[PDB]
Amino acid sequence: VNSFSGYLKLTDNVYIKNADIVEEAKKVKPTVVVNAANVYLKHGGGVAGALNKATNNAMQVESDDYIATNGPLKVGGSCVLSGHNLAKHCLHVVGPNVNKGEDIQLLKSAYENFNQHEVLLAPLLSAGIFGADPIHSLRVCVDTVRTNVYLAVFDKNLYDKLVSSFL
């Protein structure tokens, strides 16, 4: 039993809710919140900009030190950093950005990072400003992640389409 509430169960291990991941994170304090990161951990907009704003820019300060030490992530890769006031940990995961021409096949590799964590609060990778089809992203999530994932979908309209079209 865990503290996530109001989710629709899609599969044995995947759950979905119309929610703001920032507000969902501040209420659950999950062990892991997933950020929709880029390779530079520049949290300017989308999910990343919202998560970072909610940390009063502490996520960005920590991220800049990470990059100065380690260099950029790989597309499809991840790193574990602090969750600040939102979660114990933040798993920064880089899905491919279609608006940069990145290979959508890397979306599966991105979701594989979730399997290193027993339970996660997450957005749909490569959705939103990353330019992928959220229905495809949901399919890859369900077919790749084996750990328990609670997906927060900000837009009520897209949420309804994702549920209604789910196979």
Ligand X SMILES: CN(CCCC(=O)O)C(=O)c1ncnc2[nH]ccc12
Closer to ligand X by CB, 68 or 91: give it. Answer: 91
| Residue 36 in contact with ligand X, rule: CB under 6 A | yes
Residue 74: CB atoms within 10 A of its CB come to 11
The nearest distance, CB 70 to ligand X, in angstroms, is: 23
Closer to ligand X by CB, 22 or 110: give it. Answer: 22
Taking the C-alpha atoms of residue 149 and residue 123, their distance in angstroms, rounded to an integer, is 10
For ligand X, which residue of 25, 39, 46, 94 counts as binding (CB under 6 A)?
Answer: 46
Q: Which stretch binds ligand X (CB under 6 A): 3-11, 68-76, 86-94, 153-161?
A: 153-161
| Residue 129 in contact with ligand X, rule: CB under 6 A | yes
The CB-based long-range contact list for 69-77 (8 Å cut-off, 24+ gap) reads 72/39, 72/40, 73/37, 73/39, 73/41, 74/39, 75/39, 75/102, 75/103, 75/106, 75/110, 76/106, 76/107, 76/109, 76/110, 77/39, 77/109, 77/110, 77/113
The nearest distance, CB 20 to ligand X, in angstroms, is: 5
| Residue facing ligand X at closest CB distance | 128
Would you say 137 and 107 are in contact if contact means Cβ atoms under 8 Å apart? yes
| Residue 150 in contact with ligand X, rule: CB under 6 A | no
Would you say 153 and 16 are in contact if contact means Cβ atoms under 8 Å apart? yes
For ligand X, which residue of 37, 47, 79, 94 counts as binding (CB under 6 A)?
Answer: 47
- Cα dihedral 140→146→148→152 (10° resolution): -10
Closer to ligand X by CB, 1 or 41: give it. Answer: 41
Closer to ligand X by CB, 1 or 14: give it. Answer: 14
> Binding residues for ligand X, per CB under 6 A?
20-22, 36, 46-47, 50, 123, 127-130, 152-155
